[PDB]
Amino acid sequence: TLNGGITDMLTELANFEKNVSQAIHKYNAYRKAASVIAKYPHKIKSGAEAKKLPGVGTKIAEKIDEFLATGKLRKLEKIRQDDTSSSINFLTRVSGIGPSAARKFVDEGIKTLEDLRKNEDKLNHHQRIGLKYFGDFEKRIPREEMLQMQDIVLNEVKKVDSEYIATVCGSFRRGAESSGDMDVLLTHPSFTSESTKQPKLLHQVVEQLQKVHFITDTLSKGETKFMGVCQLPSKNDEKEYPHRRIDIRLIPKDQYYCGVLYFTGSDIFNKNMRAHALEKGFTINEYTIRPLGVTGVAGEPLPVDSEKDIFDYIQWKYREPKDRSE
DNA sequence: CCGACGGCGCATCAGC
DNA sequence: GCTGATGCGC
DNA sequence: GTCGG
Ligand SMILES: Nc1ncnc2c1ncn2[C@H]1C[C@H](O)[C@@H](COP(=O)(O)CP(=O)(O)OP(=O)(O)O)O1
Ligand SMILES: [Mn+2]
Ligand SMILES: [Mn+2]
Ligand SMILES: [Mn+2]
Ligand SMILES: [Mn+2]
Numbered sequence: 001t002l003n004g005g006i007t008d009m010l011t012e013l014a015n016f017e018k019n020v021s022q023a024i025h026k027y028n029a030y031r032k033a034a035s036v037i038a039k040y041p042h043k044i045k046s047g048a049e050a051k052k053l054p055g056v057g058t059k060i061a062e063k064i065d066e067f068l069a070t071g072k073l074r075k076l077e078k079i080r081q082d083d084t085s086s087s088i089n090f091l092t093r094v095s096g097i098g099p100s101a102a103r104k105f106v107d108e109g110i111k112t113l114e115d116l117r118k119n120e121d122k123l124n125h126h127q128r129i130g131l132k133y134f135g136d137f138e139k140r141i142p143r144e145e146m147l148q149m150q151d152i153v154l155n156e157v158k159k160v161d162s163e164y165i166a167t168v169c170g171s172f173r174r175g176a177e178s179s180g181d182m183d184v185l186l187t188h189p190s191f192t193s194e195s196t197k198q199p200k201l202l203h204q205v206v207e208q209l210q211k212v213h214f215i216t217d218t219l220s221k222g223e224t225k226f227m228g229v230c231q232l233p234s235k236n237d238e239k240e241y242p243h244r245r246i247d248i249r250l251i252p253k254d255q256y257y258c259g260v261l262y263f264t265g266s267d268i269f270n271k272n273m274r275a276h277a278l279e280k281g282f283t284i285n286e287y288t289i290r291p292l293g294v295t296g297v298a299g300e301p302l303p304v305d306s307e308k309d310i311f312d313y314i315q316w317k318y319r320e321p322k323d324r325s326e
Numbered sequence: 327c328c329g330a331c332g333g334c335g336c337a338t339c340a341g342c
Numbered sequence: 343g344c345t346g347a348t349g350c351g352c
Numbered sequence: 353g354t355c356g357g
């Protein structure tokens with residue numbers, strides 16, 4: 001990280017616009033600048049130098065000038081000191097508490113962990129779990145633990161049915177040394193863009209994972225998407241492992257590669273690829289890649305049998321997962 | 327200069 | 343009791 | 353906040 005100082009500043013500014021100002025587009029503007037700067041191979045020595053990069057405009061070049069000259073940013077100091085900004089920023093660290101709830105609680109005097117505890121009755125099931133594992137969720141997951149988790153999921157899935165295919169994606173697939181969570185992409189021959197809805201395809205797998213006490217809690221659960229909490233088995237007398245966030249998505253089999261691309265990310269990568277795909281006349285989502293008509297109507301789903309196929313369609317140089325960390 | 331910047335599955339609950 | 347509205351996360 | 357239109 002030749003420009004870690006600057007990108008950290010841009011990221012903190014982004015979380016502020018998202019959590020406090022509730023301006024999702026400023027949030028995204030800051031992350032775009034941070035991302036583009038993180039890819040720049042030279043140590044930025046001024047705002048004008050950074051200004052050349054797409055995503056970095058007048059205001060960010062100015063903020064960059066102050067940071068290099070002073071080593072800090074006045075705007076961020078004010079933010080850090082402000083009681084409301086700081087409280088809301090802290091509360092959003094709880095899974096289940098977004099910008100709205102955080103602002104709502106603070107206006108009522110609930111601004112700290114203790115307060116959430118005191119007013120637990122006011123929290124919904126998701127927020128209560130988030131409070132319960134506040135520390136655990138902020139811990140990173142060592143890749144070694146991820147592998148152990150990967151073995152258990154594929155194995156338990158296999159038990160339900162040998163034709164299920166579970167693929168760990170997200171940062172893990174990108175080869176990360178550690179991950180914030182575990183993202184599982186699931187498929188089965190019986191569920192395709194046609195099929196006719198197969199009831200409990202995800203339920204069975206979720207159910208099994210709960211059976212062996214791997215999944216300890218549920219945040220959300222439907223026919224195609226599961227968000228929960230899981231935990232590696234604890235030897236016997238040793239220290240329990242930290243509880244971990246787990247997301248599982250069941251997608252149609254014939255849409256596997258678009259799904260793998262999407263769920264492998266990174267998020268910014270997805271944003272980039274989709275915008276680029278539009279420049280080339282295509283429209284991509286997590287399920288398909290379609291050409292855009294002369295008028296604007298999206299055509300039919302094009303065939304895809306590898307991630308590389310998608311890169312080919314948009315004339316982009318294929319990039320291995322480890323290179324999609326933008 | 328102004329306005330697009332992605333869109334959706336799931337849970338909750340205000341308004342009736 | 344129901345559902346349209348909104349939040350949340352990704 | 354930024355950039356293309
Ligand atoms: N807002 C968004 N728009 C488009 N795509 C988005 C997205 N948020 C997440 N994604 C996609 C790409 C991520 O690799 C993938 C996993 O989503 P994720 O939130 O688990 C983050 P990950 O990249 O796994 O790193 P880590 O911090 O969890 O270890 O989901
Ligand atoms: Mn150069
Ligand atoms: Mn405020
Ligand atoms: Mn207090
Ligand atoms: Mn992840």
Ligand SMILES: [Mn+2]
Nearest residue numbers: 181182183247
């Ligand atoms: Mn995830």
Ligand SMILES: [Mn+2]
Nearest residue numbers: 275276277279
């Ligand atoms: Mn492009």
Ligand SMILES: [Mn+2]
Nearest residue numbers: 327328329353
């Ligand atoms: Mn403007």
Ligand code: NA
Nearest residue numbers: 051052053056
């Ligand atoms: Na620029």
Ligand code: NA
Nearest residue numbers: 081082083084
């Ligand atoms: Na205070």
Ligand code: NA
Nearest residue numbers: 092094095097
């Ligand atoms: Na949160």
Ligand code: NA
Nearest residue numbers: 179180181245
């Ligand atoms: Na995360």
Ligand code: NA
Nearest residue numbers: 339340341342
């Ligand atoms: Na009521």
Ligand code: NA
Nearest residue numbers: 344345346347
């Ligand atoms: Na409804």
